[PDB]
Amino acid sequence: QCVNLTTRTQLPPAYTNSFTRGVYYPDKVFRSSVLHSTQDLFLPFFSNVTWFHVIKRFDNPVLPFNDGVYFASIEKSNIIRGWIFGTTLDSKTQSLLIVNNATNVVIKVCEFQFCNDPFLDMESEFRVYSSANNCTFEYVSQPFLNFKNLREFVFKNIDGYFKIYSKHTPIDLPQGFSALEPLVDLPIGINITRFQTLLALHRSGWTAGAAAYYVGYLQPRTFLLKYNENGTITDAVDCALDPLSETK
Amino acid sequence: CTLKSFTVEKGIYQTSNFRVQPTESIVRFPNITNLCPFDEVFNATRFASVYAWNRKRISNCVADYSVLYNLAPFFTFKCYGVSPTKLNDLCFTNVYADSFVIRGDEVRQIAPGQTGNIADYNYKLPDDFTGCVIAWNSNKLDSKVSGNYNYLYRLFRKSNLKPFERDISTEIYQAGNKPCNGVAGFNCYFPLRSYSFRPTYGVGHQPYRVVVLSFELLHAPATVCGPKKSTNLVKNKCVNFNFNGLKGTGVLTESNKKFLPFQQFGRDIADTTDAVRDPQTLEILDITPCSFGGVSVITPGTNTSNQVAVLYQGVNCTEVNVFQTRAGCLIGAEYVNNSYECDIPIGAGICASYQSIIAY
Amino acid sequence: YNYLYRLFRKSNLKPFERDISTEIYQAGNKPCNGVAGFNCYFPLRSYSFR
Ligand SMILES: *[C@@H]1O[C@H](CO)[C@@H](O[C@@H]2O[C@H](CO)[C@@H](O)[C@H](O)[C@H]2NC(C)=O)[C@H](O)[C@H]1NC(C)=O
Ligand SMILES: *[C@@H]1O[C@H](CO)[C@@H](O)[C@H](O)[C@H]1NC(C)=O
Ligand SMILES: *[C@@H]1O[C@H](CO)[C@@H](O)[C@H](O)[C@H]1NC(C)=O
Ligand SMILES: *[C@@H]1O[C@H](CO)[C@@H](O)[C@H](O)[C@H]1NC(C)=O
Ligand SMILES: *[C@@H]1O[C@H](CO)[C@@H](O)[C@H](O)[C@H]1NC(C)=O
Ligand SMILES: *[C@@H]1O[C@H](CO)[C@@H](O)[C@H](O)[C@H]1NC(C)=O
Ligand SMILES: *[C@@H]1O[C@H](CO)[C@@H](O)[C@H](O)[C@H]1NC(C)=O
Ligand SMILES: *[C@@H]1O[C@H](CO)[C@@H](O)[C@H](O)[C@H]1NC(C)=O
């Protein structure tokens, strides 16, 4: 089942500064009191990150995945529930679905016939896809989840492995440092080139709760990571940002 | 041996390296969990007929086959193209479980290159089939005194079956030239015939339940990989460790390092693996390298004497005429509280001389 | 069927080592005691050359 939403208000998407966000742990190796240089897919410091709002604003475009995605969510009341990944987003190819409904976190890899406007709607109405024919992988996991919450996620698709890095912070984007812990290592082995986030409506037509999300893209670069005595990343240097950091 | 000479001049020579030699091998892998649903395949109450043979795909789990061997009723375990012993070692991308019921003398037909009713009309294996076939008697589950008429097979078909093909069609087999038009009779036969199982039959006609495990490898990462051998963990001794493929030699001691829950291995300043997390037990263990030291030999000339003293550099004397120096432990020389000129330099103000070998 | 190969052995051979011992192999936890049965197979099986 699909429902067209015809009550949107036209507005261009915004842009803002990434500051020092988007950092994640490059590997599963503990390090204590050392500085380590890594050449990985990272988000540049002070980069131009796309800003979308949910307020009558209902921002659900479909964005190119590129080599990696940093997703930031300034969220309260848990409107944002999941993501959709794939190449063509239809039954022709195979797509990955990440959802967190009211009870449990579900990860599916199926050939979904996705709606043009997929969304969630007590919550008892689910209109995301019309069909799922060939399902090759299922994974059920723990619950991942004034504006009060900052949810940071990093998605990578390297060697057919889809890495989800996550961080939760009690809170435009705040200025500070927060390393993203690796959350899910997913063995999918499929091509991903385009993604779309899933929102939840509130029904009383419909009303959109106050939320904001940010989309940034990862590029291959070197970071100098600082590890404390407890193995927690506290600071990083982008070697290609400015000559001072290059010297560092 | 180190100096490549039979005469050694007076002095101190770094000759060898004290090492605690490895005694045992400790190899560990993660706990065998997320068990593949073989209980739903083998211990199901009700299988399917051989014409509509039931296929279940098996992926993203750990498959153990020692479950099957511990039940004495599973009489036939014949396997082609892979070792039955290496079933827990060699591992595959997908496992297809095909379940059906036949009679006793047709279990032979479940093989590559065989002919019969079941092979050509009901269930065909390819000539390059890599997998196992398992069969067992099921009189107590599939035979009825009035007769079990819920098990069917295909006796008539226009052409032979391709490998791993099914045919659930009930179209009337036309054996002649007159059109059947859906009505049976002469030269017009219903293709599905009943396996009327009864408990008083002979052994070649008693019902046998068959599960065919077919293993395939694709370009996908092979996510069906069975149990990996794990031995007990021994601590505080220099053993050969191997965790998740990562091998080495070291002393595994308790660690005060608080790992974050996502971290497995640990590195120091010099980028050497010095901390690890055991796969079976979520405890943190330090891998202290085996107690290496430089063995230096303090000797006078061989013309004078053959007595030697051994200096273990940077090794405490309790971990190896025993004297403790800041350079290390000196064994074979007796400390004298008198002070003389330096003859053989030891280090940290300590010198050795021959008068026995004395250190001062 | 005159050509036979050793399908089963406890350990790998050494270089230039020949094994002609026609002893039974224990493929499971249960000992075989020199008698064929479940997971007790003759080690030497013949090729079906056609
Ligand atoms: C919601 O709107 C979209 C876009 O207008 C609809 O998608 C199109 O539906 C027509 C129906 O005939 C198809 O011919 C087009 O090919 C569709 N476009 C795409 C890009 O797929 C969608 O069907 C609408 N939802 C419902 C329930 O009608
Ligand atoms: C971000 O991009 C938009 C258009 O893509 C541009 O107008 C804007 O100036 C950019 N901002 C920065 C800080 O580069
Ligand atoms: C992935 O898909 C894109 C288009 O959707 C295509 O251009 C690209 O070649 C694909 N990559 C692989 C490895 O299949
Ligand atoms: C959430 O999704 C799972 C998977 O589809 C489903 O089993 C569960 O019932 C859903 N929860 C609710 C409240 O609908
Ligand atoms: C995918 O689905 C279609 C229709 O549901 C089916 O015909 C096709 O065989 C499926 N592909 C595989 C590999 O099973
Ligand atoms: C490291 O951990 C200890 C004990 O858990 C704590 O006292 C200390 O403050 C931590 N260091 C930092 C920088 O948070
Ligand atoms: C079937 O039941 C037996 C009964 O003891 C049990 O031991 C076995 O593990 C079960 N599963 C399989 C796959 O045989
Ligand atoms: C793993 O095996 C050990 C061995 O006793 C057991 O104590 C432990 O509960 C198991 N599970 C985990 C998650 O460590």
DSSP for B233-279 reads ---SSEEEEEETTEEEEEEEEE------TT--EEE-TTS-EEEEE-S
Tell me the C-alpha distance between A185 and B338, whole Å.
68
CB-CB under 8 Å, A29 with B263: yes
How many H helices and E strands in chain C? 0, 2
- The DSSP element (H or E) to which C2 belongs, if any, is none
Q: Ligand 8, from B230, B233, B281: best to mutate by most atoms within 8 Å of Cβ?
A: B281
Task: Please tell me the number of Cα atoms within 13 Å of B198 on its side-chain side.
Answer: 7
The shortest C-alpha distance from A124 to chain B (Å) reads 31
Of A30, A182, A189, the CB nearest to B259: A30
For chains A and C, tell me whether 3 or more CB atom pairs sit within 8 A of each other: no
User: Which residue in B262, B265, B269 is closest to A181 by CB distance?
Assistant: B262
The CA distance from B271 to the nearest CA of chain A, in Å, is 9
Whether residue B85 and residue C38 make contact (CB cut-off 8 A), yes or no, is no
Tell me the C-alpha to C-alpha distance, in Å, between residue B106 and each of A106, B50, B147, B153, B208: 44, 11, 20, 12, 9
Task: Please give the Cα distance from B289 to B241 (Å, whole number).
Answer: 11
Name the residue among B166, B165, B189 with its Cα closest to residue B49: B166
Strand segments, DSSP code E, in A76-210 are 82-86, 95-100, 105-110, 112-120, 126-132, 137-141, 149-158, 161-170, 181-187, 194-198, 202-203, 206-207
Give B266→chain A minimum CA distance, Å: 4
How remote is the CA of residue A192 from the centroid of ligand 3, in Å? 8
Which protein residue has the closest C-alpha to ligand 5 atom 8? A134
Provide the token pair at B289: 């390298």
**Mutating which of A25, A27, A29, A30 best tests the B interface, going by the most B Cβ atoms within 10 A?**
A30
CB B15 within 8 A of CB B2: yes
Closest CA–CA distance from residue A161 to any residue of chain B (Å): 9
Q: Residue B104 has which token pair? A: 């006793």
Resolution in A: 2.6
Tokens found for residue A21:
């966000």
Cα torsion angle, B239, B244, B248, B251, sign:
negative
Tokens representing A217 are 């893209």
Q: Which residue has the tokens 């240097």?
A: A237
* Helices and strands in chain B, H and E counts: 4, 24
Q: Given CB atoms, is A62 within the 8 Å cutoff of chain B?
A: no
Query: Which residue has a Cα nearest atom 9 of ligand 5?
Result: A134
A79: its two tokens: 């409107």
Say which residues have a Cβ less than 8 Å from residue B19's Cβ, sequence separation at least 6.
B290, B291, B292
Helix (H) or strand (E) run with residue A246 in it:
helix A243-247
Chain B contacts of C27, Cβ < 8 Å?
Answer: 84-85
Distance, CA of B109 to CA of B103 (rounded, Å): 11
The span from the CA of B174 to the CA of B181, in Å, is 9
Q: Are A131 and A115 in contact (CB under 8 A)?
A: no
Q: Are B257 and A32 in contact (CB under 8 A)?
A: yes
What is d(CA A72, CA B322) in angstroms, rounded to the nearest whole number?
65
d(CA A70, CA A214): 8
Q: Do A30 and B267 touch (CB under 8 A)?
A: yes
Cβ atoms of A115 and A135 closer than 8 Å: no
DSSP state of B173: E
* Residues 6+ away with beta carbon under 8 Å from A64: A193, A194
Q: Counting beta carbons within 10 angstroms of the beta carbon of residue B186, is it exposed (0 to 12), middle (13 to 18) or buried (19 or more)?
A: exposed
The chain A residue lying nearest B219, using CA atoms, is A189
What element of type H or E holds B40? helix B39-42
On whether the CB atoms of residues A71 and A52 are closer than 8 A, the answer is: no
Give the Cα separation of B233 and B220 in Å (integer).
34
* B265 interfacial to chain A (CB closer than 8 Å): yes
The C-alpha angle A120, A124, A125, rounded to 5 degrees, equals: 45
Pocket of ligand 1 (CB under 6 A): A 2, 4, 116
Q: How far is the CA of C26 from the centre of ligand 3 (A)?
A: 51
What ranges do the domains of chain A cover? 14-248
Query: How many angstroms does the Cα of residue B40 sit away from the middle of ligand 7?
Result: 10
CB contact under 8 A, A231 and B259: yes
Kindly report the backbone phi and psi dihedral angles of residue A234, in degrees, each rounded to the nearest multiple of 5, phi listed first: -115, -25
**Most informative mutation of A67, A87, A157, A194 for ligand 3 (most atoms within 8 A of CB):** A87
Q: Which of A136, A139, A231 sits opposite B263 (nearest CB)?
A: A231
Residues present in chain C in total: 50
Residue B270: partners with Cβ closer than 8 Å, 6 or more residues away = none
CB burial of residue B139 (10 Å; 0-12, 13-18, 19+): middle
**Tokens 């007590």 correspond to what residue?**
A122
Interface mutation vs chain C, best among B71, B75, B85, most C CBs within 10 Å: B85
Strands (E), chain C: 4-6, 44-46
Per the structure block, which two tokens stand in for A139? 């994974």
> DSSP 3-state assignment of B105?
helix
Distances (CA, A) of B140 to B41, B83, B108, B195, B197: 18, 32, 22, 15, 11
Residues 6+ apart with CB under 8 A from B159: none
B135 close to B93: Cβ distance less than 8 angstroms? no
Taking any CB pair shorter than 8 Å as contact, residues of chain C touching chain B are: 7-8, 27-29, 38-39
Instruction: Kindly determine whether residue A137 and residue B60, on different chains, have CB atoms separated by under 8 Å.
Output: yes
Query: What is the signed CA dihedral for B11, B14, B20, B25, rounded to 10 degrees?
Result: -150
The β-bridge partners of B322 are B331
Chain A, residues 150-179, CB within 8 A of chain B, namely 160
Collect all residues of chain B within an 8 Å Cβ-Cβ radius of residue A137: 59-60
Neighbouring CB atoms inside 10 A of B9's CB total 12
- CB-based contact B129:B112 (threshold 8 Å): yes
* Tokens representing residue B182 in the block: 């859906």
* Class (C level, CATH) for A14-248: mainly beta
**Cβ-nearest to B85 among C27, C29, C38:** C27
For chain A, breaks with the C atom over 2.5 A from the next N come after: 55, 121, 145, 171, 204
Count other C-beta atoms under 10 Å from residue A129's C-beta: 22
Pick from B60, B358, B327, B54: which is nearest to B212 by CA?
B54
Side chain identity at residue A14, one-letter code: A
Residue pair B20/B291 in contact by the 8 Å Cβ criterion = yes
